Amino acid sequence: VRSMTLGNSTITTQNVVVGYGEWPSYLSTAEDQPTQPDVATCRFYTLESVQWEKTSPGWWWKFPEALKNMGLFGQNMHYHYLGRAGYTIHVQCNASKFHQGCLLVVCVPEAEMGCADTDTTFPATELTTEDTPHVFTSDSITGKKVQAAVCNAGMGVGVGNLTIFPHQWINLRTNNSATIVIPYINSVPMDNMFRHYNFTLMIIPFAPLNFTDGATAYVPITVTIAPMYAEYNGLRLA
Amino acid sequence: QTRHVVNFHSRSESTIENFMGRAACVFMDQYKINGEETSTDRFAVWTINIREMAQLRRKCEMFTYMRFDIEMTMVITSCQMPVLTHQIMYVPPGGPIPAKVDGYEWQTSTNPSVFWTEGNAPPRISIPFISVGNAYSSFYDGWSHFTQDGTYGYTTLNAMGKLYIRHVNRSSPHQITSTIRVYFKPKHIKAWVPRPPRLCPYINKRDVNFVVTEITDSRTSITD
Amino acid sequence: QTRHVVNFHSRSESTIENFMGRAACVFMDQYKINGEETSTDRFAVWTINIREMAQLRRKCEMFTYMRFDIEMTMVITSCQMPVLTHQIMYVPPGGPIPAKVDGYEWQTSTNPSVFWTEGNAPPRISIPFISVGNAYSSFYDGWSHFTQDGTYGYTTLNAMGKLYIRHVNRSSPHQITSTIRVYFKPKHIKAWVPRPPRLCPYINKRDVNFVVTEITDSRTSITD
Amino acid sequence: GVPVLNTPGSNQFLTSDDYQSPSAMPQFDETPEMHIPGEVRNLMEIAEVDSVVPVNNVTGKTKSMDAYQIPVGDKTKPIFSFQMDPGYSSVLKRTLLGEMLNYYAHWSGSVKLTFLFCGSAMATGKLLISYSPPGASVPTSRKDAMLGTHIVWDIGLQSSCVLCVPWISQSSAGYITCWYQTNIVVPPGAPTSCDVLCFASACNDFSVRLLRDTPFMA
Amino acid sequence: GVPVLNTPGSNQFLTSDDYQSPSAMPQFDETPEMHIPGEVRNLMEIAEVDSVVPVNNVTGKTKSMDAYQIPVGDKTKPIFSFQMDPGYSSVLKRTLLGEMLNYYAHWSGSVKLTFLFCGSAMATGKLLISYSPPGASVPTSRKDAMLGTHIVWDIGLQSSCVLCVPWISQSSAGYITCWYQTNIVVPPGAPTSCDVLCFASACNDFSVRLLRDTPFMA
Known part of the structure; x- marks a missing residue:
């Protein structure tokens, strides 16, 4: 049990999957000069807990703009039109000992998703609802929105071989936390942090949740993002 | 066939340059020589993009980011005279385009063009890494116009140019209908961020839209 | 389009040789093969000068003085036989000119000429720095004839020669109308004394006369 | 000048050549290469990544995520069984492994399988994972599978058992069957029916030779 | 002799090649190069020269020299304001800077601005020159311009204030507004209304990549 703290945000944790074997870092010119906030920004932004029932097909968040209303990071998105960050993502599940299941916690950079009924587009509010996640669906759907059927997550690929990306399995038999x-x-x-979605944190239950008639009918999944090494453009003259 | 002892140890054919760097025909098109002075059927266009035919598009979608020089060689035929001379004008992403076969844009000094006369070896024109960014993006989960406007998934970084092709002969006694076959080839290719293969069939050449397809072919039971 | 981080540091495309040294078509012209034994429509002329088309003239007027070798490659077509052979005769500034397609000047040993037969690669002829002075002058604030006579602005130092082009075939059963496209290219170019860019449109190809044009496009107020 | 003579093969266009193409934009200087994370420098780096294998791809469970789930919890018939060849096999043909191998005609190597038991932390039982050589017949009973190659995988102790199947090549393959050694023993609180996920990748190193076009695209 | 074989691309005419042209006058020896003053060896040496910027290019003042004059001498609306991009901007598109940049598609660098106050030697006042980042909105008031980036330029002390605007590139830009901090204080002898000239060049070094044809010529 390690009690991590960043700024004025402390979480309680219980191995890290470093995406593509690199740790985030700063960009290192007088023609274009970055500003490194460091202060705040790096604190933990715990999203709303997500209840995982027996019939939940999955979820996805689209970052960096999933944090568009999250304090100083969400506010520096509006004053600087250029930026970059690292986003340490903790995913706890705090289920019991009698619950069973398994999750795929994958990040999928550049998840260009497809419309539900092709020959048209979707109204841009179907990819993201800032803090709250868009769920997947168990079967095919129609209408001007994202084809959110699992087995074809968002991109038209197989959902089983979505493991090529930075991933972590959360098997409730063994572990509960992912990072x-x-x-x-x-x-x-x-x-720009409003046009481009750098990656898509999607949590997909492969083995469904199961329990008996006495346990709680759900397992709340807690998502926590720490924007590391965020740097922006310069606003001062040279 | 029979199952033989396939005994060898090699992965030189599995490298990226030995996987992507193969010439494939990506553009057939017809263009006349005479008649209809204001017509669009006397020249070819083909905006250069990797999303031309599904077989090569599938390979480009193995990887999120990739950068590569392109070296295309055209194969030009003719039907129905003198000896014919052609012009294959590559315009960069920032470049004026012709509206007619006799536009002034064809004489632009910043648009490089080959003048291939019939009978020789096919014309070969090579284009370097043009893009503004540091790699071509196969996928772009973003919006071209700020504040979530229209045109999803289209970035302007992965713009490669266009390829205007015409006869340079002003006229002819009879009709000559030339056919061109552009052979696209990636060269000196690097690729970043691997990506799972495409499962569903392709719908349209400018989007990722799809119909929900089954994972694998079905069998009778779990144990047969 | 969207405003991207255009991050790089390079000025190799802004040098003079990478700015001026680009081939541009500067002379289209027709010339027959037979009929009218005393006619001026059986050969081409094009006195070589930088003031051909406004797009390249504008670039030459960035600089007052410049010196450069020229390397032009002609692109010759034909319409309507045997296999045709052409002749592109460059006469120096001090050189006799033909008056007819069958003049004796075509046989002058001091006028270099290429004999290109149809079907091969285009003919390329290179001309060194001919001028008497030490550079070609784009502008000449002076008078050719002493004591302020006629012909303002024309010096004889920036004379480059002429380019007489004909068929060498004496006759033909039918009419053949050839078209030539001269591709001018500065080479090994140096430039002195920079100069502000042209603002007004061009009027004539031998003078600097202009109509008074506005500085910039107008807007509504000083503060919008 | 130099006396040259053109050989047969001059002025032709061989599609697969590596000649110096004359660059159309010589003055142009291309953008400097920054470091982008996650470079691929060989395709077999994609085959070495584990990915979930749809073993339960029966006739009505392939457009949902029930294809990836092996139901656990009759001891006379095996739990699952499938050909062990990433090509021409419905189970292993759309895996990362099985998909980067349909781009090629000649491939040979080994393949490792991971069986992640996704049941409760209180469920306990034994499964017997048998392997048949590429010439042998499948075991019809649990005893006949025990007499060959097997691994009695205790679920209560470890929840992930890894294989490494050799002699996998094409240019009549093995079998990975699974048996109930014991039933799933479960306390009154935990659920009775569990699932087992499967995985597949290249075990140590994979050999692959002749590139071709994939059959899947039409 | 030497067995050669012609590749694809033989006997073609690529417009942009750098081959050895056979010289038509080989005997001819060209004139020796004297030293002529003022050699240009790079185009960006023209962009680094300051030149007057027509800020007051309103609908009827563009064919006179009133386009270059910013009238100084109402404190609620700014004196002048313009996009900060030498391309696609009416104010900075015909500057030496803005004109050597329309020959190119990809350019990136910084740009310095000099504000020469051409008033009397007795006139004294303050002007507040605010800069908005390329994403931000313009200040609607003087206070909102003071809370961002600004330089309270005292005219009575110095008569020339120099900026250096970064993040200037294309392949939604900044703003240089100017405000009355104070009015122009003037003795009884000197005139009341003054002018301010502006200048623009490349600040330190300028990057520029893809040559094209200029839009201005028809």
């Missing part, structure tokens, strides 16, 4: 570090994967050193 992933995603060192800002992008083709340009800095990019």
